[PDB]
Amino acid sequence: GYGNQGGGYGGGYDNYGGGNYGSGNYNVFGNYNQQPSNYGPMKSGNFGGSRNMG
Amino acid sequence: GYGNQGGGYGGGYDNYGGGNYGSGNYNVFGNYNQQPSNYGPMKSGNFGGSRNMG
Amino acid sequence: GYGNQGGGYGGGYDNYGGGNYGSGNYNVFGNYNQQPSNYGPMKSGNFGGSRNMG
Amino acid sequence: GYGNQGGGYGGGYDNYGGGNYGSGNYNVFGNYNQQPSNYGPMKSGNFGGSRNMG
Amino acid sequence: GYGNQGGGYGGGYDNYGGGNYGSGNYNVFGNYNQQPSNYGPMKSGNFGGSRNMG
Amino acid sequence: GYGNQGGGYGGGYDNYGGGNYGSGNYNVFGNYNQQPSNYGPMKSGNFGGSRNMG
Amino acid sequence: GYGNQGGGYGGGYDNYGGGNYGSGNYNVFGNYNQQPSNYGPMKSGNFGGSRNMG
Amino acid sequence: GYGNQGGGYGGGYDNYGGGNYGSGNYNVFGNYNQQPSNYGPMKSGNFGGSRNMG
Amino acid sequence: GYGNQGGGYGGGYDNYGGGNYGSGNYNVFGNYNQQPSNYGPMKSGNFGGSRNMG
Amino acid sequence: GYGNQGGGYGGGYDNYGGGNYGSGNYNVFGNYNQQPSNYGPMKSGNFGGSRNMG
Amino acid sequence: GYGNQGGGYGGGYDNYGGGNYGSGNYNVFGNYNQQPSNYGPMKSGNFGGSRNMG
Amino acid sequence: GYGNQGGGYGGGYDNYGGGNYGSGNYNVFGNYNQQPSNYGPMKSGNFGGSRNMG
Amino acid sequence: GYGNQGGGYGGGYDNYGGGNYGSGNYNVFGNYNQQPSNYGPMKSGNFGGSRNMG
Amino acid sequence: GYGNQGGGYGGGYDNYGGGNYGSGNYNVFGNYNQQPSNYGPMKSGNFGGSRNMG
Amino acid sequence: GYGNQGGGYGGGYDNYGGGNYGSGNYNVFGNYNQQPSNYGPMKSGNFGGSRNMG
Numbered sequence: 001g002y003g004n005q006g007g008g009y010g011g012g013y014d015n016y017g018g019g020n021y022g023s024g025n026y027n028v029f030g031n032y033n034q035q036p037s038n039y040g041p042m043k044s045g046n047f048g049g050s051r052n053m054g
Numbered sequence: 055g056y057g058n059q060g061g062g063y064g065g066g067y068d069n070y071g072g073g074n075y076g077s078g079n080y081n082v083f084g085n086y087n088q089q090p091s092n093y094g095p096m097k098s099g100n101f102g103g104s105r106n107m108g
Numbered sequence: 109g110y111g112n113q114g115g116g117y118g119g120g121y122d123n124y125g126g127g128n129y130g131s132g133n134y135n136v137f138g139n140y141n142q143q144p145s146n147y148g149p150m151k152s153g154n155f156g157g158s159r160n161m162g
Numbered sequence: 163g164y165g166n167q168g169g170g171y172g173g174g175y176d177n178y179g180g181g182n183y184g185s186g187n188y189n190v191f192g193n194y195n196q197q198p199s200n201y202g203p204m205k206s207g208n209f210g211g212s213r214n215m216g
Numbered sequence: 217g218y219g220n221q222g223g224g225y226g227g228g229y230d231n232y233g234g235g236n237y238g239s240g241n242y243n244v245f246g247n248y249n250q251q252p253s254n255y256g257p258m259k260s261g262n263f264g265g266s267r268n269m270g
Numbered sequence: 271g272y273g274n275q276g277g278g279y280g281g282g283y284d285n286y287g288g289g290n291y292g293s294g295n296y297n298v299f300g301n302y303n304q305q306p307s308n309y310g311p312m313k314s315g316n317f318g319g320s321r322n323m324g
Numbered sequence: 325g326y327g328n329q330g331g332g333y334g335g336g337y338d339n340y341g342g343g344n345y346g347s348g349n350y351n352v353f354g355n356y357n358q359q360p361s362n363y364g365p366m367k368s369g370n371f372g373g374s375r376n377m378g
Numbered sequence: 379g380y381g382n383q384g385g386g387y388g389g390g391y392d393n394y395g396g397g398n399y400g401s402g403n404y405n406v407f408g409n410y411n412q413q414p415s416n417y418g419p420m421k422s423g424n425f426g427g428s429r430n431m432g
Numbered sequence: 433g434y435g436n437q438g439g440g441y442g443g444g445y446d447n448y449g450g451g452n453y454g455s456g457n458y459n460v461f462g463n464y465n466q467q468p469s470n471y472g473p474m475k476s477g478n479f480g481g482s483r484n485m486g
Numbered sequence: 487g488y489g490n491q492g493g494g495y496g497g498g499y500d501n502y503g504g505g506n507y508g509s510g511n512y513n514v515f516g517n518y519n520q521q522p523s524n525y526g527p528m529k530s531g532n533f534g535g536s537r538n539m540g
Numbered sequence: 541g542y543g544n545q546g547g548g549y550g551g552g553y554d555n556y557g558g559g560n561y562g563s564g565n566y567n568v569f570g571n572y573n574q575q576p577s578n579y580g581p582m583k584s585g586n587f588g589g590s591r592n593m594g
Numbered sequence: 595g596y597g598n599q600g601g602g603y604g605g606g607y608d609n610y611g612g613g614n615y616g617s618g619n620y621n622v623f624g625n626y627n628q629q630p631s632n633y634g635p636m637k638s639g640n641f642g643g644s645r646n647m648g
Numbered sequence: 649g650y651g652n653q654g655g656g657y658g659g660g661y662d663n664y665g666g667g668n669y670g671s672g673n674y675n676v677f678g679n680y681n682q683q684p685s686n687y688g689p690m691k692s693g694n695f696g697g698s699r700n701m702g
Numbered sequence: 703g704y705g706n707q708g709g710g711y712g713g714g715y716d717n718y719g720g721g722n723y724g725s726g727n728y729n730v731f732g733n734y735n736q737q738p739s740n741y742g743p744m745k746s747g748n749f750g751g752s753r754n755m756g
Numbered sequence: 757g758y759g760n761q762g763g764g765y766g767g768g769y770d771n772y773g774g775g776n777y778g779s780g781n782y783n784v785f786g787n788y789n790q791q792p793s794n795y796g797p798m799k800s801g802n803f804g805g806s807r808n809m810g
Contacts, residue, residue, distance in 0.1 A: 001055045002055060002056045002057050003057045004057040004058045004059075004064075004065055004066050004067070004111070004120070005057065005058065005059045005060060006059070006060045007058065007060055007061045007062075007063060007064040007065045007066070007118055008061060008062045008063045008064060008118065009063045009064025009105070009118060010064045010066075011057075011058060011061075011064040011065045011066035011118065011120065012064075012066045012068075013057075013066060013067045013068070013069075014066060014068045014069070015068075015069045016068070016069065016070045016071070016098065017069075017070055017071045017072065017073070017096075017098050018069060018071075018072045018073045018127075019073045019074075020073055020074045020077075021073065021074065021075045021076060021093070022075075022076045022079075022091070023073075023074035023075070023076055023077045023078050023079065023128075024074075024077075024078045024079070024080075025079045025080065025081070026080045027079070027080070027081045027082070027083075027089070028081075028082045028083075029081070029082070029083045029084065029087045030084045030085070031084065031085045031086065031087075032085070032086045032087070032470070032472075032524040032526060033083070033087045033088070034087075034088045034089075034090075034522045034524060035088070035089045035090075036088075036089075036090045036091075036520045036522060037076070037089075037090070037091045037092070038091075038092045038094075038518055038520065039075075039092065039093045039094055040094045041094035041095045041096070041097065041148070042071075042094065042095075042096045042097065042098070043097045043101075044070050044071055044096075044097070044098045045070045045097070045098055045099045045100055045101065045104075046099075046100045046101070046104035046105055046158075047097075047101045047102055047104065048101070048102045048104070049102050049103045049104050049106065050100075050102075050104045050105070051064075051100075051104055051105045052103075052104065052105065052106045052107075052108065053063075053106065053107045053108045053162075054108045055109045056109060056110045056111050057111045058111040058112045058113075058118075058119055058120050058121070058165070058174070059111065059112065059113045059114060060113070060114045061112065061114055061115045061116075061117060061118040061119045061120070061172055062115060062116045062117045062118060062172065063117045063118025063159070063172060064118045064120075065111075065112060065115075065118040065119045065120035065172065065174065066118075066120045066122075067111075067120060067121045067122070067123075068120060068122045068123070069122075069123045070122070070123065070124045070125070070152065071123075071124055071125045071126065071127070071150075071152050072123060072125075072126045072127045072181075073127045073128075074127055074128045074131075075127065075128065075129045075130060075147070076129075076130045076133075076145070077127075077128035077129070077130055077131045077132050077133065077182075078128075078131075078132045078133070078134075079133045079134065079135070080134045081133070081134070081135045081136070081137075081143070082135075082136045082137075083135070083136070083137045083138065083141045084138045084139070085138065085139045085140065085141075086139070086140045086141070086416070086418075086470040086472060086524050087137070087141045087142070088141075088142045088143075088144075088468045088470060088522045088524065089141075089142070089143045089144075090142075090143075090144045090145075090466045090468060090520045090522055091130070091143075091144070091145045091146070092145075092146045092148075092464055092466065092518040092520060093129075093146065093147045093148055094148045094518060095148035095149045095150070095151065095202070096125075096148065096149075096150045096151065096152070097151045097155075098124050098125055098150075098151070098152045099124045099151070099152055099153045099154055099155065099158075100153075100154045100155070100158035100159055100212075101151075101155045101156055101158065102155070102156045102158070103156050103157045103158050103160065104154075104156075104158045104159070105118075105154075105158055105159045106157075106158065106159065106160045106161075106162065107117075107160065107161045107162045107216075108162045109163045110163060110164045110165050111165045112165040112166045112167075112172075112173055112174050112175070112219070112228070113165065113166065113167045113168060114167070114168045115166065115168055115169045115170075115171060115172040115173045115174070115226055116169060116170045116171045116172060116226065117171045117172025117213070117226060118172045118174075119165075119166060119169075119172040119173045119174035119226065119228065120172075120174045120176075121165075121174060121175045121176070121177075122174060122176045122177070123176075123177045124176070124177065124178045124179070124206065125177075125178055125179045125180065125181070125204075125206050126177060126179075126180045126181045126235075127181045127182075128181055128182045128185075129181065129182065129183045129184060129201070130183075130184045130187075130199070131181075131182035131183070131184055131185045131186050131187065131236075132182075132185075132186045132187070132188075133187045133188065133189070134188045135187070135188070135189045135190070135191075135197070136189075136190045136191075137189070137190070137191045137192065137195045138192045138193070139192065139193045139194065139195075140193070140194045140195070140308070140310075140416040140418060140470050141191070141195045141196070142195075142196045142197075142198075142414045142416060142468045142470065143195075143196070143197045143198075144196075144197075144198045144199075144412045144414060144466045144468055145184070145197075145198070145199045145200070146199075146200045146202075146410055146412065146464040146466060146518065147183075147200065147201045147202055148202045148464060148518070149202035149203045149204070149205065149256070150179075150202065150203075150204045150205065150206070151205045151209075152178050152179055152204075152205070152206045153178045153205070153206055153207045153208055153209065153212075154207075154208045154209070154212035154213055154266075155205075155209045155210055155212065156209070156210045156212070157210050157211045157212050157214065158208075158210075158212045158213070159172075159208075159212055159213045160211075160212065160213065160214045160215075160216065161171075161214065161215045161216045161270075162216045163217045164217060164218045164219050165219045166219040166220045166221075166226075166227055166228050166229070167219065167220065167221045167222060168221070168222045169220065169222055169223045169224075169225060169226040169227045169228070170223060170224045170225045170226060171225045171226025171267070172226045172228075173219075173220060173223075173226040173227045173228035174226075174228045174230075175219075175228060175229045175230070175231075176228060176230045176231070177230075177231045178230070178231065178232045178233070178260065179231075179232055179233045179234065179235070179258075179260050180231060180233075180234045180235045181235045181236075182235055182236045182239075183235065183236065183237045183238060183255070184237075184238045184241075184253070185235075185236035185237070185238055185239045185240050185241065186236075186239075186240045186241070186242075187241045187242065187243070188242045189241070189242070189243045189244070189245075189251070190243075190244045190245075191243070191244070191245045191246065191249045192246045192247070193246065193247045193248065193249075194247070194248045194249070194308040194310060194362070194364075194416050195245070195249045195250070196249075196250045196251075196252075196306045196308060196414045196416065197249075197250070197251045197252075198250075198251075198252045198253075198304045198306060198412045198414055199238070199251075199252070199253045199254070200253075200254045200256075200302055200304065200410040200412060200464065201237075201254065201255045201256055202256045202410060202464070203256035203257045203258070203259065204233075204256065204257075204258045204259065204260070205259045205263075206232050206233055206258075206259070206260045207232045207259070207260055207261045207262055207263065207266075208261075208262045208263070208266035208267055209259075209263045209264055209266065210263070210264045210266070211264050211265045211266050211268065212262075212264075212266045212267070213226075213262075213266055213267045214265075214266065214267065214268045214269075214270065215225075215268065215269045215270045216270045248308050248362040248364060250306045250308065250360045250362060252304045252306055252358045252360060254302040254304060254356055254358065254410065256302060256410070271325045271379045271380060272325060272326045272327050272380045273327045273380050273381045273382040273383065273389075273391075273434075273436070274327040274328045274329075274334075274335055274336050274337075274382045274383065274385065274389060275327065275328065275329045275330060275382075275383045275384070276329070276330045276383060276384045276385055277328065277330055277331045277332075277333060277334040277335045277336075277385045277386060277389075278331060278332045278333045278334060278385075278386045279333045279334025279375070279385060279386045279387045280334045280336075280382075280385040280386060280387025280388045280389040280390075280429075280439055280440065280441060280443065281327075281328060281331075281334040281335045281336035281382055281385045281389045282334075282336045282338075282382050282385075282388075282389035282390045282391060282392060282436070282443065283327075283336060283337045283338070283382075283391045284336060284338045284339070284390075284391075284392045284393075284394070285338075285339045285392070285393045285394065285395070285396060286338070286339065286340045286341075286368065286394045286395055286422050286423045287339070287340055287341045287342065287343070287366075287368050287394075287395045287396075287420075287422055288339060288341075288342045288343045288395065288396045289343045289344075289395070289396045289397045289398055289399065289401075290343055290344045290347075290397075290398045290399065290401035290402075290455075291343065291344065291345045291346060291363070291399045291400075291401070291417075292345075292346045292349075292361070292399060292400045292401055292403075292415070293343075293344035293345070293346055293347045293348050293349070293398075293401045293402075294344075294347075294348045294349070294350075294401050294402045295346075295349045295350065295351070295400075295401070295402070295403045295405070296350045296402075296403065296404045296405070297349070297350070297351045297352070297353075297359070297403070297405045297406075297407070298351075298352045298353075298405070298406045298407070298571070298625045298626070298679060298680075299351070299352070299353045299354065299357045299405075299406075299407045299411070300354045300355070300407065300408045300409060300626060300680060301354060301355045301356060301357075301408070301409045301410070302355070302356045302357070302409060302410045303353070303357045303358070303407045303409075303410070303411045303412075304357075304358045304359075304360075304411070304412045304413075304414075305358075305359045305360075305405070305412075305413045305414075305415075306358075306359075306360045306361075306412075306413075306414045306415070307346070307359075307360070307361045307362070307400070307414075307415045307416075308361075308362045308364075308415070308416045308417065309345075309362065309363045309364055309399070309417045310364045310416075310417055310418045310419035310420065310473070311364040311365045311366070311367065311419045311420075312341075312364065312365075312366045312367065312368070312395075312419070312420045312422075313367045313371075313419065313420065313421045313422070313423070313425075314340050314341055314366075314367070314368045314394065314395050314420070314422045314423055315340045315367070315368055315369045315370055315371065315374070315423045315424075316369075316370045316371070316374035316375055316423055316424045316428075316429075317367075317371045317372055317374065317421075317423065317424070317425045317426075318371075318372045318374070318425055318426045318427050318428075319372050319373045319374050319376065319427045319430075320370075320372075320374045320375070320423070320424035320425065320426070320427050320428045320429055320430065320478075321334075321370075321374055321375045321387070321424055321428070321429045321430065322373075322374065322375065322376045322377075322378065322427065322430045322431065323376065323377045323378045323430075323431045324378045324430065324431045324432045324485075327380075327382070334385055334386065334387060334389065336382070336389065344401075352571045352572070352625060352626075354572060354626060364419070374424075378431075379433045379434060380434045381434050381435045381436040381437065381443075381445075381488075381490070382436045382437065382439065382443060383436075383437045383438070384437060384438045384439055385439045385440060385443075386439075386440045387439060387440045387441045388436075388439040388440060388441025388442045388443040388444075388483075388493055388494065388495060388497065389436055389439045389443045390436050390439075390442075390443035390444045390445060390446060390490070390497065391436075391445045392444075392445075392446045392447075392448070393446070393447045393448065393449070393450060394448045394449055394476050394477045395448075395449045395450075395474075395476055396449065396450045397449070397450045397451045397452055397453065397455075398451075398452045398453065398455035398456075398509075399453045399454075399455070399471075400453060400454045400455055400457075400469070401452075401455045401456075402455050402456045403454075403455070403456070403457045403459070404456075404457065404458045404459070405457070405459045405460075405461070406459070406460045406461070406625070406679045406680070406733060406734075407459075407460075407461045407465070408461065408462045408463060408680060408734060409462070409463045409464070410463060410464045411461045411463075411464070411465045411466075412465070412466045412467075412468075413459070413466075413467045413468075413469075414466075414467075414468045414469070415454070415468075415469045415470075416469070416470045416471065417453070417471045418470075418471055418472045418473040418474065418527070419473045419474075420449075420473070420474045420476075421473065421474065421475045421476070421477070421479075422448065422449050422474070422476045422477055423477045423478075424477055424478045424482075424483075425475075425477065425478070425479045425480075426479055426480045426481050426482075427481045427484075428477070428478035428479065428480070428481050428482045428483055428484065428532075429441070429478055429482070429483045429484065430481065430484045430485065431484075431485045432484065432485045432486045432539075433487045433488060434488045435488050435489045435490040435491065435497075435499075436490045436491065436493065436497060437490075437491045437492070438491060438492045438493055439493045439494060439497075440493075440494045441493060441494045441495045442490075442493040442494060442495025442496045442497040442498075442537075443490055443493045443497045444490050444493075444496075444497035444498045444499060444500060445490075445499045446498075446499075446500045446501075446502070447500070447501045447502065447503070447504060448502045448503055448530050448531045449502075449503045449504075449528075449530055450503065450504045451503070451504045451505045451506055451507065451509075452505075452506045452507065452509035452510075453507045453508070453509070453525075454507060454508045454509055454511075454523070455506075455509045455510075456509050456510045457508075457509070457510070457511045457513070458510075458511065458512045458513070459511070459513045459514075459515070460513070460514045460515070460679070460733045460734070460787060460788075461513075461514075461515045461519070462515065462516045462517060462734060462788060463516070463517045463518070464517060464518045465515045465517075465518070465519045465520075466519070466520045466521075466522075467513070467520075467521045467522075467523075468520075468521075468522045468523070469508070469522075469523045469524075470523070470524045470525065471507070471525045472524075472525055472526045472527040472528065473527045473528075474503075474527070474528045474530075475527065475528065475529045475530070475531070475533075476502065476503050476528070476530045476531055477531045477532075478531055478532045478536075478537075479529075479531065479532070479533045479534075480533055480534045480535050480536075481535045481538075482531070482532035482533065482534070482535050482536045482537055482538065483495070483532055483536070483537045483538065484535065484538045484539065485538075485539045486538065486539045486540045514733070514787045514788070516788060541595045542595060542596045542597050542651075543597045544597040544598045544599075544604075544605055544606050544607070544651070544660070545597065545598065545599045545600060546599070546600045547598065547600055547601045547602075547603060547604040547605045547606075547658055548601060548602045548603045548604060548658065549603045549604025549645070549658060550604045550606075551597075551598060551601075551604040551605045551606035551658065551660065552604075552606045552608075553597075553606060553607045553608070553609075554606060554608045554609070555608075555609045556608070556609065556610045556611070556638065557609070557610055557611045557612065557613070557636075557638050558609060558611075558612045558613045558667075559613045559614075560613055560614045560617075561613065561614065561615045561616060561633070562615075562616045562619075562631070563613075563614035563615070563616055563617045563618050563619065563668075564614075564617075564618045564619070564620075565616075565619045565620065565621070566620045567619070567620070567621045567622070567623075567629070568621075568622045568623075569621070569622070569623045569624065569627045570624045570625070571624060571625045571626060571627075572625065572626045572627070573623070573627045573628070574627075574628045574629075574630075575627075575628070575629045575630075576628075576629075576630045576631075577616070577629075577630070577631045577632070578631075578632045578634075579615075579632065579633045579634055580634045581634035581635045581636070581637065581688070582611075582634065582635075582636045582637065582638070583637045583641075584610050584611055584636075584637070584638045585610045585637070585638055585639045585640055585641065585644075586639075586640045586641070586644035586645055586698075587637075587641045587642055587644065588641075588642045588644070589642050589643045589644050589646065590640075590642075590644045590645070591604075591640075591644055591645045592643075592644065592645065592646045592647075592648065593603075593646065593647045593648045593702075594648045595649045596649060596650045596651050596705075597651045598651040598652045598653075598658075598659055598660050598661070598705070598714070599651065599652065599653045599654060600653070600654045601652065601654055601655045601656075601657060601658040601659045601660075601712055602655060602656045602657045602658060602712065603657045603658025603699070603712060604658045604660075605651075605652060605655075605658040605659045605660035605712065605714065606658075606660045606662075607651075607660060607661045607662075607663075608660060608662045608663070609662075609663045610662070610663065610664045610665070610692065611663070611664055611665045611666065611667070611690075611692050612663060612665075612666045612667045612721075613667045613668075614667055614668045614671075615667065615668065615669045615670060615687070616669075616670045616673075616685070617667075617668035617669070617670055617671045617672050617673065617722075618668075618671075618672045618673070618674075619670075619673045619674065619675070620674045621673070621674070621675045621676070621677075621683070622675075622676045622677075623675070623676070623677045623678065623681045624678045624679070625678060625679045625680060625681075626679065626680045626681070627677070627681045627682070628681075628682045628683075628684075629682070629683045629684075630682075630683075630684045630685075631670070631683075631684070631685045631686070632685075632686045632688075633669075633686065633687045633688055634688045635688035635689045635690070635691065635742070636665075636688065636689075636690045636691065636692070637691045637695075638664050638665055638690075638691070638692045639664045639691070639692055639693045639694055639695065639698075640693075640694045640695070640698035640699055640752075641691075641695045641696055641698065642695075642696045642698070643696050643697045643698050643700065644694075644696075644698045644699070645658075645694075645698055645699045646697075646698065646699065646700045646701075646702065647657075647700065647701045647702045647756075648702045649703045650703060650704045650705050650759075651705045652705040652706045652707075652712075652713055652714050652715070652759070652768070653705065653706065653707045653708060654707070654708045655706065655708055655709045655710075655711060655712040655713045655714075655766055656709060656710045656711045656712060656766065657711045657712025657753070657766060658712045658714075659705075659706060659709075659712040659713045659714035659766065659768065660712075660714045660716075661705075661714060661715045661716070661717075662714060662716045662717070663716075663717045664716070664717065664718045664719070664746065665717070665718055665719045665720065665721070665744075665746050666717060666719075666720045666721045666775075667721045667722075668721055668722045668725075669721065669722065669723045669724060669741070670723075670724045670727075670739070671721075671722035671723070671724055671725045671726050671727065671776075672722075672725075672726045672727070672728075673724075673727045673728065673729070674728045675727070675728070675729045675730070675731075675737070676729075676730045676731075677729070677730070677731045677732065677735045678732045678733070679732060679733045679734060679735075680733065680734045680735070681731070681735045681736070682735075682736045682737075682738075683736070683737045683738075684736075684737075684738045684739075685724070685737075685738070685739045685740070686739075686740045686742075687723075687740065687741045687742055688742045689742035689743045689744070689745065689796070690719075690742065690743075690744045690745065690746070691745045691749075692718050692719055692744075692745070692746045693718045693745070693746055693747045693748055693749065693752075694747075694748045694749070694752035694753055694806075695745075695749045695750055695752065696749075696750045696752070697750050697751045697752050697754065698748075698750075698752045698753070699712075699748075699752055699753045700751075700752065700753065700754045700755075700756065701711075701754065701755045701756045701810075702756045703757045704757060704758045704759050705759045706759040706760045706761075706766075706767055706768050706769070707759065707760065707761045707762060708761070708762045709760065709762055709763045709764075709765060709766040709767045709768075710763060710764045710765045710766060711765045711766025711807070712766045712768075713759075713760060713763075713766040713767045713768035714766075714768045714770075715759075715768060715769045715770070715771075716768060716770045716771070717770075717771045718770070718771065718772045718773070718800065719771070719772055719773045719774065719775070719798075719800050720771060720773075720774045720775045721775045721776075722775055722776045722779075723775065723776065723777045723778060723795070724777075724778045724781075724793070725775075725776035725777070725778055725779045725780050725781065726776075726779075726780045726781070726782075727778075727781045727782065727783070728782045729781070729782070729783045729784070729785075729791070730783075730784045730785075731783070731784070731785045731786065731789045732786045732787070733786060733787045733788060733789075734787065734788045734789070735785070735789045735790070736789075736790045736791075736792075737790070737791045737792075738790075738791075738792045738793075739778070739791075739792070739793045739794070740793075740794045740796075741777075741794065741795045741796055742796045743796035743797045743798070743799065744773075744796065744797075744798045744799065744800070745799045745803075746772050746773055746798075746799070746800045747772045747799070747800055747801045747802055747803065747806075748801075748802045748803070748806035748807055749799075749803045749804055749806065750803075750804045750806070751804050751805045751806050751808065752802075752804075752806045752807070753766075753802075753806055753807045754805075754806065754807065754808045754809075754810065755765075755808065755809045755810045756810045
């Protein structure tokens with residue numbers, strides 16, 4: 001693994017979004033079980049005209 | 055793995071979106087089980103005219 | 109793996125969208141089971157005229 | 163694997179959309195089981211006149 | 217694998233759309249099982265006059 | 271309406287099964303809607319050698 | 325309407341099965357709509373040697 | 379309406395099963411809506427050799 | 433309405449099962465809504481050799 | 487309305503099961519709403535050889 | 541109503557533009573009806589230096 | 595109502611623009627109805643140096 | 649109502665702009681109805697140096 | 703009402719702009735109704751040095 | 757009401773701007789209703805050095 005050398009703007013290994021969202025669960029249910037799950041909107045990155053050049 | 059050398063703008067290995075969203079689950083259910091799941095909108099990247107050049 | 113050398117704009121190995129969305133599940137259900145799943149819109153990339161040149 | 167050398171704009175190995183969407187599932191159901199699944203619209207790439215040249 | 221050398225615009229190995237959409241499933245159902253699946257519109261690429269030259 | 275007069279066994283106006291099962295619905299759906307419905311077995315009447323004479 | 329007068333066994337106006345099963349629906353759907361429906365076996369009447377005489 | 383007069387066994391206006399099971403619904407849905415419904419087995423009447431004569 | 437006069441056993445206007453099970457609902461949903469519903473088995477009447485004569 | 491006159495056993499207007507089970511609901515939902523509902527088994531009537539004659 | 545008496549130029553009761561443009565419509569629509577309407581530019585009067593004096 | 599008497603130029607009761615533009619509509623719509631309406635630019639009067647004196 | 653008597657230029661009761669623009673509408677809508685309306689620019693009067701004196 | 707008597711220029715009762723712009727509407731909406739309205743710029747009067755004296 | 761008598765320039769009862777802009781509306785909305793309204797710039801009067809004296 002080698003990082004970026006150069007660039008007009010800042011070049012980096014930016015991780016904005018990732019991971020596990022309710023994954024790898026081990027559920028054993030009997031009869032009347034309810035497991036609701038809600039995940040809100042995910043906004044990862046540059047928003048509102050960010051990282052602009054003057 | 056070798057990173058970017060150069061560019062007019064910042065060249066980098068940017069990861070905006072990824073991962074697991076309710077994957078790899080192990081569910082064993084009996085009789086009347088309910089497992090609802092909702093995932094909101096995913097916005098990954100540059101939004102609103104971001105990373106622009108002046 | 110060799111990264112980009114150069115370009116007019118920032119050349120990089122950008123990953124905007126990816127991953128698993130409710131994949132690889134192991135479900136064993138008996139009788140009356142309900143497993144609803146909803147995934148919202150996925151917006152990956154550049155939006156609203158992003159990464160433009162002046 | 164060799165990256166792009168040069169170009170008028172930023173040449174890179176951009177991955178906008180991909181992955182698994184409810185794939186590779188292992189489901190064994192008995193009697194009255196319901197497994198509904200909805201996937202919203204996927205927008206991957208450049209939208210709204212993005213990555214333009216002035 | 218060798219990347220693009222040059223071009224008037226940014227030449228890169230861009231992947232806009234791909235992957236598996238409910239593929240490779242292993243389903244064994246008995247009696248009255250329902251497995252509905254809906255996939256929304258997929259928009260991969262450049263939209264709204266993107267990647268234009270001034 | 272006049273009921274039964276007599277008989278060797280009990281004569282009556284027995285209603286074992288009836289009604290509406292998801293009938294008269296008013297559904298107006300747009301785009302990707304799923305409305306699954308499952309109704310289990312209906313057993314109406316005399317079962318297991320019922321209402322027998324010694 | 326006059327009921328039964330007499331008989332060796334019990335004579336009556338027995339209604340075992342009837343009704344509406346997903347009838348008279350008013351559905352107006354647009355684009356990609358799915359409305360699956362399953363009705364299980366209906367067993368109406370006398371079963372297992374019922375209403376026998378000794 | 380006149381009830382039963384007589385009989386060897388008890389003659390009556392017995393209602394074992396009936397009613398509405400998810401009927402007359404007024405649903406107006408937009409985009410990705412899921413409304414699953416499961417109804418279990420209905421056992422109405424005499425079971426296990428009931429209402430027998432010695 | 434006139435009740436039963438007589439009989440070998442007790443003649444009465446017995447209502448074992450009935451009513452509304454999720455009927456007459458007024459649902460107006462937008463975007464990603466899930467309304468799962470499960471109804472268990474209904475056992476109405478005489479079970480296990482009930483109301484027998486010695 | 488006139489009740490039962492007589493009988494070998496107790497003749498009465500017995501109501502074992504009835505009512506509304508999540509009926510007549512007025513639900514207006516927006517975006518990602520989940521309303522799961524489970525109703526257990528309903529046992530209405532005479533069970534285990536009840537109301538027998540010696 | 542009395543007309544103009546005199547003037548340096550021609551005085552008259554000139555009506556250049558007027559009327560009803562899709563007005564007073566009686567529309568009763570059911571389910572998915574579309575009634576688009578476009579009205580082009582209206583140029584009423586004197587244009588290009590008209591009604592000039594030498 | 596009395597018209598103009600005199601003037602250096604032509605005095606008259608000129609009506610250039612007026613009327614109803616999609617007014618007084620009676621619309622009763624059910625479910626998914628769309629009634630778009632576009633009205634172009636209205637130019638009423640004297641344009642391009644009209645009604646000038648030499 | 650009495651008109652103008654005299655003047656250096658033509659004095660008149662000129663109506664350039666007026667009327668109703670989507671007014672007095674009677675709309676009764678149910679569920680998902682859309683009634684968009686666009687009105688273009690209105691230019692009423694004298695433009696481009698009109699009604700000038702030499 | 704008496705009109706103008708005299709003046710250096712043409713004195714008149716000029717109405718350039720007026721009327722109703724989406725006024726007096728009677729709207730009764732149920733559930734998800736959208737009624738967007740756009741009115742363009744209104745230019746009423748004398749523009750570009752109009753009604754000038756030489 | 758008496759009009760102007762005289763003046764160096766044309767004296768008149770000029771109405772440049774007025775009226776109702778989305779006023780007097782009768783709106784009764786239920787649940788999720790949206791009624792956006794945009795009114796553009798209003799320019800009423802004399803612009804660009806109009807009605808000047810030489």
